Design a protein around this ligand. Sequence first.
Ligand SMILES: [Zn+2]
Ligand SMILES: [Zn+2]
Ligand SMILES: [Zn+2]
Length: 245
Amino acid sequence: SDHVDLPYNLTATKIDSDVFVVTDRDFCSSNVLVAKMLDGTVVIVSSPFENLGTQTLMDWVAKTMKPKKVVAINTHFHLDGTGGNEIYKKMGAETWSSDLTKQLRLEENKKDRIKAAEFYKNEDLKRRILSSHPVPADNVFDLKQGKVFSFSNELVEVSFPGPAHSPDNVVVYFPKKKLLFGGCMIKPKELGYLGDANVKAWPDSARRLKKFDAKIVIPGHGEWGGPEMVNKTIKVAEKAVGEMR
Ligand SMILES: [Zn+2]
Ligand SMILES: [Zn+2]
Ligand SMILES: [Zn+2]
């Protein structure tokens, strides 16, 4: 079948033999891409919110893919992005983000934990959030220049299309699979949490994603789709600009 149910309400859904989406349903249905490169390297894009979810994800990756190496790419500084870094590191993964994402995560870490913890209503989820201590990635590239990974000539392209959902949001493109992980700047129905959003910039940042020849676009939350995901996002952001003036 199309998915496997994992502990802590994680879902792992197959897109093909070498591409999976793992969804943290407990924490806002956050999507994590897991792509196995031909040379055995596993690339993970984004993260579950915290340690229990991330440990569950890594246990499943270990069991099912037995990777030679794991490379984890943070999409932005939010917990669906950096929440996995502690456990990724502990498990021997190489964690990556832009320099801005690291900076924003470090700044976010200075803020009051217990006050920001009442943002969730369930007490078990609160205790899971408070039990984790998010850290930035170990390896950093310059936001504006992006980064292209080459795993035995299999390319993974990380680029900054401009501020949208957050000032630092990047997308990850896999040209071999024509797959774009757009992350939380892909919002085909409604923009969602705007705490760090640049609504005025969002339509043009999303327009810049049209350059990718994507057959599959994976959003940070919710069902994935095709290139129309980008078009839907642009209109949703425009309506927000329209009301906002
Ligand atoms: Zn199921
Ligand atoms: Zn976010
Ligand atoms: Zn998100």
